[PDB]
Protein backbone atom coordinates (compact mmCIF):
# COMPACT_ATOMS: atom_id res chain seq x y z
CA UNK A 1 0.00 0.00 0.00
CA UNK A 2 1.24 3.44 -1.04
CA UNK A 3 0.72 6.52 1.09
CA UNK A 4 0.81 10.13 -0.12
CA UNK A 5 2.86 12.35 2.21
CA UNK A 6 0.90 15.44 3.23
CA UNK A 7 3.41 17.81 1.63
CA UNK A 8 2.68 16.38 -1.86
CA UNK A 9 -1.04 17.06 -1.35
CA UNK A 10 -0.43 20.50 0.21
CA UNK A 11 1.26 21.88 -2.88
CA UNK A 12 -1.55 20.45 -5.07
CA UNK A 13 0.60 17.94 -6.98
CA UNK A 14 -2.18 15.28 -7.19
CA UNK A 15 -4.19 17.74 -9.36
CA UNK A 16 -1.45 17.48 -11.98
CA UNK A 17 -1.08 13.71 -11.65
CA UNK A 18 -4.85 13.53 -12.18
CA UNK A 19 -4.44 15.46 -15.48
CA UNK A 20 -1.67 13.04 -16.50
CA UNK A 21 1.36 15.26 -15.73
CA UNK A 22 3.88 13.49 -13.59
CA UNK A 23 7.25 14.93 -14.62
CA UNK A 24 7.98 12.51 -17.49
CA UNK A 25 11.17 13.22 -19.44
CA UNK A 26 12.25 16.01 -17.05
CA UNK A 27 15.79 15.63 -15.79
CA UNK A 28 16.25 16.53 -12.10
CA UNK A 29 19.69 16.50 -10.44
CA UNK A 30 19.68 15.94 -6.68
CA UNK A 31 22.98 17.53 -5.65
CA UNK A 32 23.39 15.95 -2.21
CA UNK A 33 24.85 12.88 -0.43
CA UNK A 34 24.00 10.42 -3.24
CA UNK A 35 20.82 8.38 -3.79
CA UNK A 36 20.31 4.76 -2.81
CA UNK A 37 19.49 3.46 -6.30
CA UNK A 38 18.48 0.08 -4.85
CA UNK A 39 15.39 1.46 -3.10
CA UNK A 40 12.26 -0.20 -4.49
CA UNK A 41 10.49 3.14 -4.49
CA UNK A 42 13.02 4.99 -6.62
CA UNK A 43 14.34 4.84 -10.16
CA UNK A 44 17.73 6.61 -10.58
CA UNK A 45 18.52 7.39 -14.24
CA UNK A 46 22.20 8.21 -13.75
CA UNK A 47 24.56 10.36 -11.73
CA UNK A 48 28.14 11.17 -10.88
CA UNK A 49 30.17 11.58 -7.73
CA UNK A 50 32.16 14.75 -7.08
CA UNK A 51 33.64 13.30 -3.84
CA UNK A 52 37.20 12.12 -4.65
CA UNK A 53 36.98 9.79 -1.65
CA UNK A 54 33.63 8.15 -2.59
CA UNK A 55 33.29 7.34 -6.32
CA UNK A 56 29.82 5.82 -6.23
CA UNK A 57 26.89 8.26 -6.29
CA UNK A 58 24.48 5.33 -5.97
CA UNK A 59 25.35 4.66 -2.35
CA UNK A 60 24.03 7.07 0.18
CA UNK A 61 25.96 6.89 3.47
CA UNK A 62 24.20 9.92 4.91
CA UNK A 63 20.52 9.26 4.09
CA UNK A 64 19.81 12.86 3.10
CA UNK A 65 20.06 12.58 -0.66
CA UNK A 66 17.74 9.52 -0.69
CA UNK A 67 15.11 11.32 1.38
CA UNK A 68 15.25 14.42 -0.87
CA UNK A 69 15.08 12.18 -3.95
CA UNK A 70 11.93 10.48 -2.64
CA UNK A 71 10.15 13.82 -2.21
CA UNK A 72 10.95 14.71 -5.82
CA UNK A 73 10.21 11.36 -7.42
CA UNK A 74 9.18 8.35 -5.29
CA UNK A 75 7.41 6.08 -7.72
CA UNK A 76 3.69 5.85 -8.28
CA UNK A 77 3.00 2.18 -7.51
CA UNK A 78 1.64 0.00 -4.67
CA UNK A 79 4.38 0.67 -2.15
CA UNK A 80 6.01 3.32 -0.03
CA UNK A 81 5.35 6.99 -0.76
CA UNK A 82 4.64 9.18 -3.79
CA UNK A 83 6.90 11.93 -5.08
CA UNK A 84 5.88 15.30 -6.45
CA UNK A 85 7.02 14.30 -9.96
CA UNK A 86 6.91 10.51 -9.87
CA UNK A 87 7.93 10.11 -13.51
CA UNK A 88 10.93 12.50 -13.41
CA UNK A 89 14.39 11.26 -14.43
CA UNK A 90 16.38 11.41 -11.22
CA UNK A 91 20.13 11.94 -11.21
CA UNK A 92 22.32 11.45 -8.16
CA UNK A 93 25.02 14.09 -7.98
CA UNK A 94 27.09 13.20 -4.90
CA UNK A 95 28.81 16.25 -3.38
CA UNK A 96 28.60 15.35 0.33
CA UNK A 97 30.20 12.47 2.20
CA UNK A 98 28.77 10.16 4.83
CA UNK A 99 29.33 13.00 7.37
CA UNK A 100 27.09 15.27 5.27
CA UNK A 101 30.05 17.59 4.64
CA UNK A 102 31.31 18.82 1.31
CA UNK A 103 33.77 21.13 -0.35
CA UNK A 104 32.59 24.17 -2.31
CA UNK A 105 34.71 22.89 -5.21
CA UNK A 106 32.75 19.59 -5.13
CA UNK A 107 29.42 21.44 -5.21
CA UNK A 108 30.65 23.64 -8.11
CA UNK A 109 31.80 20.49 -9.95
CA UNK A 110 28.36 18.97 -9.39
CA UNK A 111 26.64 22.08 -10.84
CA UNK A 112 28.98 21.97 -13.83
CA UNK A 113 28.19 18.30 -14.36
CA UNK A 114 24.46 19.09 -14.29
CA UNK A 115 24.89 21.85 -16.94
CA UNK A 116 27.02 19.58 -19.19
CA UNK A 117 24.47 16.80 -18.78
CA UNK A 118 21.48 18.96 -19.74
CA UNK A 119 19.64 18.78 -16.45
CA UNK A 120 16.35 20.66 -16.38
CA UNK A 121 16.18 21.19 -12.63
CA UNK A 122 18.84 21.19 -9.92
CA UNK A 123 17.91 20.73 -6.25
CA UNK A 124 20.50 21.75 -3.63
CA UNK A 125 19.21 20.84 -0.15
CA UNK A 126 22.41 22.30 1.29
CA UNK A 127 23.74 25.62 2.46
CA UNK A 128 26.46 27.35 4.39
CA UNK A 129 26.86 30.74 6.01
CA UNK A 130 29.58 31.77 3.55
CA UNK A 131 29.42 32.11 -0.23
CA UNK A 132 32.16 32.36 -2.83
CA UNK A 133 32.47 34.13 -6.19
CA UNK A 134 33.02 30.70 -7.81
CA UNK A 135 29.80 29.36 -6.18
CA UNK A 136 27.80 32.36 -7.41
CA UNK A 137 29.30 32.02 -10.89
CA UNK A 138 28.26 28.34 -11.04
CA UNK A 139 24.63 28.94 -10.04
CA UNK A 140 24.45 31.93 -12.35
CA UNK A 141 25.86 29.88 -15.20
CA UNK A 142 23.28 27.12 -14.63
CA UNK A 143 20.46 29.69 -14.75
CA UNK A 144 21.91 31.35 -17.88
CA UNK A 145 22.14 27.87 -19.39
CA UNK A 146 18.40 27.26 -18.88
CA UNK A 147 18.45 25.23 -15.62
CA UNK A 148 15.88 25.77 -12.83
CA UNK A 149 17.99 26.02 -9.64
CA UNK A 150 16.24 25.41 -6.31
CA UNK A 151 17.89 25.42 -2.90
CA UNK A 152 16.97 25.14 0.77
CA UNK A 153 16.87 28.55 2.44
CA UNK A 154 18.66 27.24 5.57
CA UNK A 155 17.70 26.18 9.06
CA UNK A 156 19.11 29.17 10.88
CA UNK A 157 15.86 30.64 12.18
CA UNK A 158 15.93 34.31 13.10
CA UNK A 159 18.87 36.50 14.10
CA UNK A 160 17.59 40.00 14.99
CA UNK A 161 17.05 41.94 11.76
CA UNK A 162 19.64 39.99 9.74
CA UNK A 163 19.01 37.68 6.82
CA UNK A 164 19.78 34.12 7.80
CA UNK A 165 19.36 32.67 4.26
CA UNK A 166 22.37 30.47 3.51
CA UNK A 167 24.35 30.09 0.30
CA UNK A 168 23.59 29.30 -2.42
CA UNK A 169 19.99 30.15 -1.52
CA UNK A 170 20.99 33.78 -0.93
CA UNK A 171 21.83 34.38 -4.62
CA UNK A 172 19.12 36.02 -6.69
CA UNK A 173 19.43 33.43 -9.48
CA UNK A 174 18.41 30.64 -7.05
CA UNK A 175 14.92 29.88 -5.79
CA UNK A 176 15.40 29.77 -1.98
CA UNK A 177 12.76 27.66 -0.23
CA UNK A 178 11.67 28.02 3.38
CA UNK A 179 9.63 25.51 5.38
CA UNK A 180 6.03 25.53 6.60
CA UNK A 181 4.06 22.78 8.41
CA UNK A 182 0.65 21.35 7.48
CA UNK A 183 -1.07 24.42 8.94
CA UNK A 184 0.89 26.80 6.69
CA UNK A 185 2.89 27.99 9.68
CA UNK A 186 6.54 28.84 9.22
CA UNK A 187 8.78 26.36 11.03
CA UNK A 188 10.85 28.07 13.75
CA UNK A 189 14.10 26.80 12.24
CA UNK A 190 13.34 28.21 8.76
CA UNK A 191 15.83 30.87 7.64
CA UNK A 192 14.49 34.37 7.02
CA UNK A 193 15.39 37.39 4.93
CA UNK A 194 14.77 39.28 1.70
CA UNK A 195 16.31 36.44 -0.35
CA UNK A 196 13.65 33.92 0.70
CA UNK A 197 11.46 33.23 -2.30
CA UNK A 198 8.80 30.61 -1.62
CA UNK A 199 7.71 28.20 1.11
CA UNK A 200 6.98 24.48 0.91
CA UNK A 201 6.22 21.74 3.49
CA UNK A 202 9.27 21.00 5.58
CA UNK A 203 8.09 19.58 8.92
CA UNK A 204 7.77 15.82 9.48
CA UNK A 205 8.24 14.96 5.80
CA UNK A 206 7.95 11.26 5.16
CA UNK A 207 10.16 9.99 2.33
CA UNK A 208 12.49 7.17 1.31
CA UNK A 209 15.56 6.20 3.31
CA UNK A 210 18.45 3.90 2.31
CA UNK A 211 17.96 0.17 2.71
CA UNK A 212 14.28 -0.04 1.81
CA UNK A 213 13.17 2.20 4.66
CA UNK A 214 10.97 5.27 5.10
CA UNK A 215 11.23 8.08 7.62
CA UNK A 216 10.32 11.64 8.41
CA UNK A 217 12.69 14.59 8.56
CA UNK A 218 12.47 18.29 9.30
CA UNK A 219 14.29 21.02 7.41
CA UNK A 220 14.35 23.41 4.54
CA UNK A 221 16.19 20.54 2.83
CA UNK A 222 12.81 18.77 2.83
CA UNK A 223 10.94 21.86 1.50
CA UNK A 224 13.31 22.36 -1.45
CA UNK A 225 12.53 19.09 -3.28
CA UNK A 226 8.82 19.97 -3.21
CA UNK A 227 9.67 23.02 -5.36
CA UNK A 228 12.16 21.08 -7.55
CA UNK A 229 9.41 18.45 -8.07
CA UNK A 230 6.90 21.25 -8.83
CA UNK A 231 9.23 22.65 -11.52
CA UNK A 232 9.40 19.16 -13.09
CA UNK A 233 5.61 18.93 -13.17
CA UNK A 234 5.38 22.33 -14.83
CA UNK A 235 7.95 21.35 -17.47
CA UNK A 236 6.14 18.08 -18.14
CA UNK A 237 2.98 20.10 -19.02
CA UNK A 238 4.89 22.95 -20.75
CA UNK A 239 8.13 21.60 -22.21
CA UNK A 240 8.64 24.80 -24.15
CA UNK A 241 8.79 27.03 -21.09
CA UNK A 242 12.09 28.52 -20.07
CA UNK A 243 13.43 28.38 -16.49
CA UNK A 244 12.47 32.07 -16.25
CA UNK A 245 8.85 31.20 -17.05
CA UNK A 246 8.83 28.20 -14.62
CA UNK A 247 10.21 30.42 -11.82
CA UNK A 248 7.75 33.26 -12.51
CA UNK A 249 4.83 30.84 -12.61
CA UNK A 250 5.73 29.40 -9.23
CA UNK A 251 6.33 32.79 -7.61
CA UNK A 252 3.26 34.50 -9.03
CA UNK A 253 0.68 31.84 -8.16
CA UNK A 254 1.58 31.17 -4.49
CA UNK A 255 -0.90 31.27 -1.62
CA UNK A 256 0.20 34.41 0.23
CA UNK A 257 1.06 33.59 3.88
CA UNK A 258 2.56 36.37 5.95
CA UNK A 259 5.33 38.89 5.89
CA UNK A 260 7.74 38.26 2.99
CA UNK A 261 10.80 38.42 5.27
CA UNK A 262 9.46 35.23 6.86
CA UNK A 263 7.41 33.64 4.12
CA UNK A 264 8.74 35.06 0.83
CA UNK A 265 5.91 34.96 -1.71
CA UNK A 266 4.07 32.25 0.24
CA UNK A 267 3.25 28.61 -0.39
CA UNK A 268 3.67 27.17 -3.86
CA UNK A 269 0.58 25.86 -5.60
CA UNK A 270 1.57 23.63 -8.56
CA UNK A 271 -2.02 23.45 -9.89
CA UNK A 272 -2.12 27.24 -10.29
CA UNK A 273 1.49 27.49 -11.53
CA UNK A 274 0.97 24.80 -14.19
CA UNK A 275 -1.55 26.93 -16.17
CA1 LIG B 1 5.46 4.50 -4.23
NA1 LIG C 1 17.16 33.66 -3.75
User: Is 263 within 8 Å of 257 (Cβ atoms)?
Assistant: yes
Distance 169 CA to ligand 2 centre (A): 5
State how far the Cα of 266 lies from the Cα of 20, in Å rounded to an integer: 26
Which residues carry out catalysis?
32, 64, 221
User: Is 45 within 8 Å of 91 (Cβ atoms)?
Assistant: yes
Provide φ and ψ at 268, rounded to 5°: -70, 145
Q: How many Cα atoms occupy the beta-carbon half-sphere of 135 within 13 Å?
A: 22
Q: Is 169 annotated as a binding residue?
A: yes
Q: Is 26 annotated as a binding residue?
A: no
**Way it was determined:** X-ray
Q: Is 60 annotated as a binding residue?
A: no
User: Residue 103: exposed, middle, or buried by beta-carbon count in 10 A (0-12, 13-18, 19+)?
Assistant: middle
Best CA proximity match to 180, nearest among 153, 150, 227, 220: 220
Q: Is 77 annotated as a binding residue?
A: yes
| Strand pairing category for 205-209 and 213-217 | antiparallel
State how far the Cα of 94 lies from the Cα of 102, in Å rounded to an integer: 9
Closest ligand relative to 82 C-alpha: 1
Distance 259 CA to ligand 1 centre (A): 36
User: Is 166 within 8 Å of 185 (Cβ atoms)?
Assistant: no
State how far the Cα of 78 lies from the Cα of 81, in Å rounded to an integer: 9
Closest ligand relative to 247 C-alpha: 2
Provide φ and ψ at 205, rounded to 5°: -85, 120
- What is the fold, at CATH topology level, of the domain defined by 1-275? Rossmann fold (3.40.50)
What is the radius of gyration, based on Cα positions, of the chain? 16
Q: Which residues lie below 8 Å from residue 179, measured CB to CB, with a gap of 6+?
A: 153, 186, 187, 189, 190, 199, 200, 201, 202, 203, 218, 219, 220, 222, 223
Q: How many Cα atoms occupy the beta-carbon half-sphere of 18 within 13 Å?
A: 8
In terms of phi and psi (left: phi > 0; alpha: psi -120 to 50; beta: otherwise), the region of 193 is: left
Q: Is 2 annotated as a binding residue?
A: yes
Distance 188 CA to ligand 1 centre (A): 30
User: Is 265 within 8 Å of 254 (Cβ atoms)?
Assistant: yes
| Strand pairing category for 89-94 and 198-201 | unpaired
User: Is 164 within 8 Å of 190 (Cβ atoms)?
Assistant: no
User: Is 188 within 8 Å of 195 (Cβ atoms)?
Assistant: no
Strands (E), 50-143: 89-94, 121-124
State how far the Cα of 31 lies from the Cα of 35, in Å rounded to an integer: 10
- Model resolution, angstroms: 1.6
Distance 150 CA to ligand 2 centre (A): 9
Best CA proximity match to 244, nearest among 116, 155, 166, 147: 147
User: Residue 105: exposed, middle, or buried by beta-carbon count in 10 A (0-12, 13-18, 19+)?
Assistant: middle
Provide φ and ψ at 136, rounded to 5°: -60, -45
Residue ranges with CB less than 5 Å from ion ligand 1:
2, 41, 75, 77, 79-80
| Strand pairing category for 198-201 and 175-180 | parallel
Closest ligand relative to 79 C-alpha: 1
Distance 186 CA to ligand 2 centre (A): 17
Provide φ and ψ at 243, rounded to 5°: -60, -40
Domain coordinates in residue numbering, the chain: 1-275
Amino acid sequence: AQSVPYGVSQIKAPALHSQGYTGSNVKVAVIDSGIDSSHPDLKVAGGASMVPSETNPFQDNNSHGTHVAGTVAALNNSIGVLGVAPSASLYAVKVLGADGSGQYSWIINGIEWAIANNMDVINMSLGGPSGSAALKAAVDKAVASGVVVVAAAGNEGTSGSSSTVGYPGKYPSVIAVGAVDSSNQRASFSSVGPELDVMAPGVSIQSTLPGNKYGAYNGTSMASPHVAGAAALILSKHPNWTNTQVRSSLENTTTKLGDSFYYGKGLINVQAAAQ
